[PDB]
Amino acid sequence: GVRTSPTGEKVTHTGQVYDDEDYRRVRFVGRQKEVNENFAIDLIAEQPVSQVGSRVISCDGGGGALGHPRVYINLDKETKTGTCGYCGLQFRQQH
Amino acid sequence: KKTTGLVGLAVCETPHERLKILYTKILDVLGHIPKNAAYRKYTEQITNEKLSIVKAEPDVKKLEEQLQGGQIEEVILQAENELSLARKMIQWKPWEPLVEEPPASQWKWPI
Amino acid sequence: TQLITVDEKLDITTLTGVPEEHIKTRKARIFVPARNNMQSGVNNTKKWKMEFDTRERWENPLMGWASTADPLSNLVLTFSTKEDAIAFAEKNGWSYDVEERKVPKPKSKSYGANFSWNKRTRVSTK
Amino acid sequence: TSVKPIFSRDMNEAKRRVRELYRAWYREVPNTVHLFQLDISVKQGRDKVREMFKKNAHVTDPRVVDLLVIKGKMELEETINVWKQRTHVMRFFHETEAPRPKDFLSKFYVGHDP
Amino acid sequence: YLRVLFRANDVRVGTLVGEDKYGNKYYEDNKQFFGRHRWVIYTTEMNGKNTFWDVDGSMVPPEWHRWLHCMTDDP
Amino acid sequence: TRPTVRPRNDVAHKQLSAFGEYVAEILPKYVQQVQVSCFSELEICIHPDGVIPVLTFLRDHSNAQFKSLADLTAVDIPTRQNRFEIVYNLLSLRFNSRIRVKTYTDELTPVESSVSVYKAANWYEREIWDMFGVFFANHPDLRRILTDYGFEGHPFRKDFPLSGYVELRYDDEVKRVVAEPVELAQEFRKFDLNSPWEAFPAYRQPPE
Amino acid sequence: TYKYVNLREPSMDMKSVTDRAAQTLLWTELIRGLGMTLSYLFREPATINYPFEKGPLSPRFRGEHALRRYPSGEERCIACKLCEAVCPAQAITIEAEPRADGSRRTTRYDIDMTKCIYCGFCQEACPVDAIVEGPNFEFSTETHEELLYNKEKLLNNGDKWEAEIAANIQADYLYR
Amino acid sequence: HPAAHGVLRLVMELSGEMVRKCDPHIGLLHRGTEKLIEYKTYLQALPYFDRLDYVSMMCNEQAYSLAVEKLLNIQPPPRAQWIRVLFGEITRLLNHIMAVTTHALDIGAMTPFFWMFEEREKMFEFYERVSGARMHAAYVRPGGVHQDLPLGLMDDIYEFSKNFSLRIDELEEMLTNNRIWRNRTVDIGVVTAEDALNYGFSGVMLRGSGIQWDLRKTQPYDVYDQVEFDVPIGSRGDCYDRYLCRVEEMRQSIRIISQCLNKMPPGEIKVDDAKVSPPKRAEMKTSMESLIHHFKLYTEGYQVPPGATYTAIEAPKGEFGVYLVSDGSSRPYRCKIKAPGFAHLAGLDKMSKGHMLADVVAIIGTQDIVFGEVDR
Amino acid sequence: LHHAVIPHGKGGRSSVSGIVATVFGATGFLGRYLVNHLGRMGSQVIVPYRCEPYDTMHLRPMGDLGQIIFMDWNGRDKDSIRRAVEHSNVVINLVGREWETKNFDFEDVFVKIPQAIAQVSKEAGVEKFIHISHLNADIKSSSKYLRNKAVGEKEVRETFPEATIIKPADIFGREDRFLNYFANIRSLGKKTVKQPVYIVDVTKGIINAIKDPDARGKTFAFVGPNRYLLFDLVQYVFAVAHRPWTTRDKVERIHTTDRTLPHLPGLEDLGVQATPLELKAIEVLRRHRTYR
Amino acid sequence: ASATRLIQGLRNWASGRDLQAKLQLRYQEISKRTQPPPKLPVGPSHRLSNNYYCARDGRREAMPPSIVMSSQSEKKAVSPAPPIKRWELSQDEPYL
Ligand SMILES: NC(=O)C1=CN([C@@H]2O[C@H](COP(=O)(O)OP(=O)(O)OC[C@H]3O[C@@H](n4cnc5c(N)ncnc54)[C@H](OP(=O)(O)O)[C@@H]3O)[C@@H](O)[C@H]2O)C=CC1
């Protein structure tokens, strides 16, 4: 979702939203400052982190050649979830 | 004959004697050239070999067959241009010793 | 035909037509691009690079790109020696600053020197 | 460095060929400035011609002086023909400023400059 | 009929594959050549821009864009 | 080996070595190097005082026709006493063979402009005059080709940079096109692509 | 093997010369040319009517330069810069930043559409198929500013269709 | 000017409608391609050889890829050789039909333009279906053809070859022994074969005027040694005969395409060397060495041994030459292009000495000048 | 001054100078050449228009990549003017139609337009608001044009008193109006002294006034050094031309005067070289058939 | 198809080309798109146990150039390449 800058407009997902005396605002006159209201971080919070019974597991991303190459992550520490570098979704183990 | 191939090519009535007197002028102008240069050696060898091919040729089509580099007035043009360079090769004296040195690492390529 | 020689430099600096500020003010630098230390290997050595001083790159006022007023910013002249570098620099016109070539000093090293009964080199973990 | 010559054996024919070039440029101005329909007096164009000759005072070698005469003769060919245009002749002029300074104070305020 | 008489030219309804939201109509034939298999009829005021006249490309949704540029064989 | 490696020739390599040795013997006056690479195309490398004699001898002498010309290029290399390299490239009609005729020169000493034996080289010589500066004595017309009229510099040099010293735009102040010092809109971010670890060990020059 | 043409003498038979004279007087094969013109006159044209009957295409067509994201997930790009390394006109401008969690992502992603030459080298080099050549071609702009794209423009351009791009990749993934 | 096919400034200093001199000024379309390839790498600068000659979209790609292979001592697999020869003849057909079409526009001849550009629209649909490009298909990586043809191509090539034989017979019906087109263009453009040698002419000029010379049947640089055809040679000058030469090269190109569909083996796409060609998707997503080779092959490019090579192909305009100079490096040092358009343009004044300006337009028409290729 | 407002690099073509210009008018003559010199300088120009977009497309190729920007307004509203002057470093006021339309008189354009825009300019906190005015705009009679511009001078001096009022004489250029009417012929004898001023020295004085402070408050004048008679100028313009919606306020203007005022500084005090009318008159005296 | 027989007779009457047969209207001769996907195999490699890169390393076999003469009674004078014999006339209809 979009936040509220003191300009009364839509901020960006990365912090480049304008100051109150930027004339780039006054070259945004009368047209859409377009923004993708879906943000990247807003989907990770709704991810069910799965529970695989092995120790060091695999990740492909739903079929080879549609996604990312085989990355292998570890489930040693129970204080930190195993985060993929490509997928951006975590993994856990149980025993 | 009639309806020859190339555009700038109109053969004469008696090709063999024209080609022979061309090659005798080749041997003559080569006779002006000194002996120890290899130019005389290789040109006199190749022209006496081609003339010795031609001396046993009664037919024009047979000479176009056996002599390689045909057909007829391409051979004549080859002869005329060889005569012109021989006349130029009296000049320029191109059998001198080697002209002076390169930088001697100029042709070392990968720099 | 054996014309006269003179003890002079060469003067193509008005034959090539480059503007005068880019003639005079561009203080060149001749240097050896040394070993990229995060890599290994000196294959990228042995080539004297003549390059030029850098100037400003400002924000493009629409995209934040680095728009420059520099023709002579991206040149790299690849040489093999130093005398020919000086000759080319005197030939085309500008001035220059010179780095040396700093080869690695070879040092005596041995695994039988890594181990010793009465010297204080002790890996203690291998 | 017993270099092959170009046109001249010393500076004498170099000066003779460049003064013949300047003679041709003096008698070359009025025809072109009447033909090409310019906005500039004949004397101003002739003064930029003699100014462009004044720019090259440090040129010494006979090869280089002859090569400048070759460039000038090629350009006089391309201007006695209408291969070139009004744009090129007005590009010899420097009228649309560009008033770019030289004072260190004005190289300092309008700065990031030597 | 004046709808299609001054829309462009056609009278060739008779295959009736279907329609889609924004109301737009899609007709696939096999009787003609390759190039007039699949044709489209644009509706009126699909987003309030009075699109009976001055019709635009890409007023179609993208699944019919893939279907209609002859990349597939089924709607 | 038997697939995926381009097979070399033997007898054609032998014949081109024999022919290069032949030319090198029968012209002692203008010969420095003859060489054959792996893909068997002959190379002759020449001092720049016998250019028209070598081209007349390589047009005729009847055991080398070589009637087709290519490219002339004086390929620019720094660091040398003689930068510029005239590269002729000749094809024969009766023979099916290829020779390269590379003579060398520096920035100012002209060569004899071999247009009088090959009429193809006229526009080639004018073009390489416009782009390099290898002046051509005994030549009818040296104009400028592939360049602007008011532009100069011989821009295929390694001194002239990628973008030019000139820029054109339009103004309505004087209703015409004017020139400016150049103003790029992007950096042209140059990519460092010089890999370590001895890309080809067979081409190691003796280290200084 | 050569087949050289235009070699004939004109046949001097009486029948041949009267047929050629009738050809000269009546302009006969000129009328044969008119017959060919009528034979194409009485065909039916293979045109398409433009907004209503669009021309065909190919599955590997390269248009819009969109971006994909993960199946129920976030941005597929990593900012690995291979697309700048292979983009020949250097239209790819990428300045990355890692995000607020730590995984490496972007800030400044720019495809200069005025400079793009539509090869597909960024389609080849992209190790996750993040950047994809789009299917359609309507840029068609009354301005210059609207040509140059940014990250949110390209992601809105990738949110206008996904199953389009997924269908084309599922058609094309075995070949490339 | 619309008869100036492309752009060609031409200062004709004439006597009135019957000339004195003409000078082709070219370089108006100058783009700096040699300097750009000096500041680029190989794979990144292959679209310059897409865009240089903008008619032979596959022939010059074949020329540059075979230049790199002849430099690099690598044989491609034979299936890629057959497909490359197939598309070489296909693009040869497109170039000959553009030559006939632009001569038709330069001479009048309004409708065969439209007929044969409907056929060339079918050609462009073939390029779309193969490479995904409209008119500039890269498609020929150095190291064999990448991203090969799907199922559904050879059927269309077969049926289009039958239809095209019918259409070239219909073009011979409409034009080709027409009365006044012939009386318009026979007696013009005669160049002596001695000077056709020594003006540097090549290809179709040396076809139509005299000499018998084909790079294909004299020099095997691809699978041309296994296919059989014949090539027309000129009677004596006479631009009409040059037109007949173009038409018979078209029909024999159709015969070569029929033979090539008869002799297509289903072996492999690319070479057996991952350090030359990038690997495919499954190896890219699974195996380590494929990803390392992918990554360094698309950052740096494969290293190339130093060499100053040249090769030339029989492009439909003539001896298309590419001259590479490669340091032991990943960027080639200096490359140059021998343009048959440049060579055929060199003899323009001598072709148009003693004629009128209408023949000057027809001599621009008799040689398919494009001037992207002439520019270097 | 905010960041990325600071000047950068050599001049022109992405030289982000210390001005952000907002120009009113500029669809006509003098404002278009002013935007021409601003795009030569390389700043961002906000310009509105109520006209057909042809002239604003015509001045599109002036600035750099996406620099200049266009909007809309009218002589009725306040919101669009405020939207124009939302974020403006410098702002100039050129306005005025030289004939009466059916809804805009000579009245109330110079009265109603500079009041609202200069008031919201002061209410936007801008610096160096510049407003044009004709020379000798007097309350004295026989000049509706000059008396309305004098009322405009009074209003601009009333609200935001330290605005730069600029008064040149008549302006000869490339698309001049009064010299076109001089050329617009086909018997009358009169006299009145007059001296004009050239357009590019005027606009160089404008940009020196807009980026050189110590200039505010006090009004400036820009007159060429000619100082001769109307009859000599008619002889001059017809000797160079080689010939043997209009009101009579035009003829009142060209028979008024050109008198000087020594209270205020001019060309040399502001520091731009004055060019006479000779070769620029040779430029602008075309259309003749075969003497060139 | 979809034409009357009278205009078909006129099309044959205009020229003997049989325009009904091949007509430049591709109807269903195009293969029906979206077939089941075909696999793309690998040729003379990817078998294990033998395929060394030490063997087929044609890239690393680029030889340095071999040289003859420099600055550093003979029955001879061969050609660079053998004189290729003159070609053959056409089988199917040359002129003549
Ligand atoms: N020498 C001097 O000192 C002189 C100075 N001037 C002044 O200099 C400027 C340029 O001179 P000039 O050539 O005569 O005129 P111009 O045509 O160049 O400029 C007049 C401008 O005023 C605009 N304008 C006028 N009335 C309205 C309105 N009701 N609504 C919107 N826009 C309006 C016009 O817009 P549009 O065209 O789009 O309708 C136009 O942009 C003017 O401001 C004028 O007052 C004029 C004459 C002499």
Ligand code: SF4
């Ligand atoms: S190649 Fe793909 S993953 Fe890499 S930076 Fe470009 S878009 Fe991102």
Ligand code: SF4
């Ligand atoms: S298609 Fe080509 S030019 Fe376009 S972004 Fe990709 S690599 Fe760059």
Ligand SMILES: [Zn+2]
């Ligand atoms: Zn993963």
